[PDB]
Amino acid sequence: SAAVKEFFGSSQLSQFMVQNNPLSEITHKRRISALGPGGLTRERAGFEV
DNA sequence: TGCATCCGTGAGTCGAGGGTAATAAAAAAACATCATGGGTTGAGTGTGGTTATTGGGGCATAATCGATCTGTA
């Protein structure tokens, strides 16, 4: 339960869901990110990615 | 001299939630320490008490009107 709770809420890929519009809802749930565990960082990422 | 190796660097205001957790032993004795409760100091705040009065009203001792029967050309 500790590990699953840390992933659900304390991880980078789980963040508060935007609720301004239904469009914001859809475009936040249909989102692809290249960060988080095993991914790049904004400082590290160059140009090709 | 060439080689790998290590060591700093790299923006700017801003917002919103904002904290989570793999584990573990009990006895005993011994001692320290605060917590409450009851009793002296002591420290007040509390309350009447005598004696300084200064305006006010008062009674004396004087005073300036108001009203009528006797003396002078």
What is the separation of C-alpha A47 from the centre of its chain, rounded to a whole number of angstroms? 21
At how many Å resolution was this determined? 3.2
Q: Give the CA A24 to C1' B3 distance in Å.
A: 55
Identify whether the C-beta of residue A17 lies closer than 8 Å to the C-beta of residue A25.
yes
Rounded Cα distance between A24 and A30, Å, is 10
Q: A36 Cβ partners below 8 Å, 6+ apart?
A: A11, A12, A13
Query: Experimental method for this entry?
Result: cryo-EM
Residues lining strand B at under 7 Å (Cβ) are A 1-2, 5-6, 10, 16, 43
